[PDB]
Symmetry: D3
Subunit: 188 residues, 6 copies
């Protein structure tokens, strides 16, 4: 259906390199649609930056302890599809945070808690797939000053436990999207 | 941008045909991507039912008073995009219900409040567009026995005022989905 | 992956209407990609004829005992993809027949043995999916005047056993098509 | 109609670069859908390998005398289409081999004889086209040990003459795929 | 890349009631497979159930004429409405350029051809689940045309229907083939 | 709608890199469909020539003073759409020149005035958009010997005023293309 790989023992960093096509397959032998969830540092390299806006105003994307979500879908490489899914997934996370008594807020693809930004994300396409990245702060250390952040520990949430519950939630989200797309007749 | 039309004074019943392509243009001359919001009865004619499951199970889809959202997007007619978009929109309505002091939750594409179903929705495509319907009960009368439904009236929400506030939230969501798809470069 | 349903307990006739979108989901509740193999009569109503040339030559498509394969794939509805896939499937059946000691040959999408035609097939699309039909003559009773047919019975092949073995071959063919499509990088 | 260029006498080596877009037009001015068939060495450069599986087990793809087929189709750049069309072509070559009295069988995209692999192949897409490469061993020298190989010479087949007959059969295959795709009406 | 099909019906007249806009029309009726352009002459009386322009339906317009040159184009390309619309206006533009070689000061307003403020044509572009379908119609006479908009025909311009049909058909086929050839000789860009 | 940016203040040279995707957005902050018209020199680097026939003929694309039109549309990346649109725009310019009392003619995508070439143009796609460039000669100085060339100056057309009028006509043409595509029903 969809491959879920949660790297639970070691750690892996994110330099924006994992956004490329076939990243999950080339590095994990995971074939087709897949969600790879890991935890590590965050120092996106300029040459791997997808947001053309972050570049024009050379913004810096940093973090030390962040939870990473790498999604690759071999669907029609439509930028509108990538954008829609990304915000649907962020919205699922925002709702999930409420199970922990946390009042999250969504501003497009960004998640906010008590006015502070908890996440980062990007959605785009390759010539053969949809790639999406979601990042949730665990600790606010290493994050570039300007806007202020917040993380999972300060919110009283165990990361490894959140990775299990949230990865499951996102997979369910995507599978429901696929199933619903197959039970409806086209209309004139 | 996107066209928005909220019908506040007249009532319009939904028998399922509003789901057809070019409905907004044929009926009101609204050209291109549009969202039409109105209120009226709901009794979907078997010949107009989109969910094939619902036909298989001979199910009824009726309500005496419901707020309706008919969306047409002239994007690539992909069923997966239609499906994604549909749930992101429902998710936005749920987040909007929190601003009203309501603990609503989402179960795929259905809206729930205290174990009772508040909505109905369907998403599909025509040969030239994406079409989405979202129905929200105002009253509980006329709604088919099976699930326990709840309406906006019992939740103490003025339909007219909600239609305005939710319509603006849904249009804002779609336009952001669009702008975001335009600010990212493709990846290898 | 894909669902396979071989109707073994009873006969089902083909009037061409099984070529329509969501046929398998509507009649058997099978969601998504699917192959439904069954046995019955064949009498295509001019109403349901897909080959435009046949409608021109006012030809008849009938047979009293035929093995039917109805394939539906919810992939991009591309007529070229439907046509390529159809002929690959026909080619697989021709190779399979040699495993039974039969010398079959292919002429595009038609199978021949002893210069006689054994099959009929059609590949088209709906607004939401690819649809393919393959019919193999079990007996040559009820077949039209014009050209010689030959059926499995005459070839000494058991329909039941062949339905089982060919259905698995086709499903495996389609699965490999899908797997290979996911292990290759795009090129410049 | 499609373009065919057979390079019999001059030898062209294959290092994997011929798989890129516009290769045929760019080098020989052959515009549009085309099949170029030549002979030469094979030594695929790891930076030019399309199959990611091989990059994983970092295999080697080489031989000293191989018949090469480079196909480019400016159809919708769909990986599923590239994959299916590929396998239909490999299948047509197998059917051709039977005409030479060869007991050839297919295993996905590979041709075997006596349990030995006679070929290599790959199918992928560029942002503007479909590209397929089929390689047949003429001789087994230079080939890397692991899986046992076999060549056209050992089969007692004249390379040049096979090149002429095989190229023709492949072009005919693609042309029927196209014509069949234009004679069918779409279905509901 | 290679070619396309053309058929000019010179032996008789065929009336356009809008149903020729349907997919596989040329193949169903004339056996012409694939991309094609069919040119004929006859009356124009579009049935409301065959009308494609939704705006014509809303305004309840009559699409009539007693003598018109019809062009029915079908292209089995990606059934994209934007492609259909672009291509349709490129062809009307070519027809405009062509009238100049006949000494006519004609102009273009979208997909409509005008001469001295008077409308000479009608046209529509759309898609079917499997193809692009385009219709172009040029008044031969302005008889039978519903009153309102000032119409002009080929006769009043001193152009021979038959000869124009032949030259314009060739002009449109060449236009399409250059559109195809140009798409094939360009590399994609990052 | 569509963003139009006419650069009147300074000049900008075209080396061919402006044809890249998101050029207008990275350089001017213009998001979405856009037309950027500017004036400058034409010196196209071989590593950025798009017309492969130009590479094969080793042609030079030089000019000292030229009016440049760089169009980017985030529509389906269909090379046939790119091609079609490009020649429709060139046809508009040719029509526009008539209102200047000039006897212009069109040869595919090239504009002619008395057997002399006034323009250069290319149409292609990126993995996410359609990119077109139109170039009109202001002065025939710097253009390589070969085809008798011609410019705006010699036609007595003020570049600045023409840039203003031509730009509005192109934008206008693109909108009608869009609008017309939205008011038509699909056909069976």
């Amino acid at each position: 259906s969809m491959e879920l790989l949660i790297i639970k023992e070691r750690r892996i960093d994110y330099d924006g390199s994992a956004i490329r096509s076939h990243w999950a397959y080339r590095n994990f032998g995971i074939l087709g649609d897949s969600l790879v969830v890991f935890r590590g540092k965050c120092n996106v390299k300029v040459e791997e930056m997808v947001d053309i806006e972050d570049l024009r105003l050379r913004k810096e994307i940093k973090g030390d302890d962040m939870v990473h979500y790498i999604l690759e879908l071999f669907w029609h490489p439509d930028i509108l599809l990538a954008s829609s899914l990304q915000k649907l997934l962020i919205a699922r996370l925002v709702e999930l945070l409420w199970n922990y008594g946390i009042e999250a807020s969504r501003r497009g693809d960004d998640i906010y808690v008590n006015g502070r930004k908890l996440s980062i994300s990007i959605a785009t396409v390759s010539p053969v797939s949809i790639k999406i990245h979601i990042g949730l702060n665990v600790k606010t250390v290493g994050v570039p000053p300007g806007v202020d952040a917040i993380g999972l520990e300060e919110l009283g949430i165990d990361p490894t436990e959140f990775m299990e519950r949230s990865a499951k939630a996102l997979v369910e989200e995507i599978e429901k999207v696929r199933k619903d797309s197959l039970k409806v007749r086209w209309v004139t």
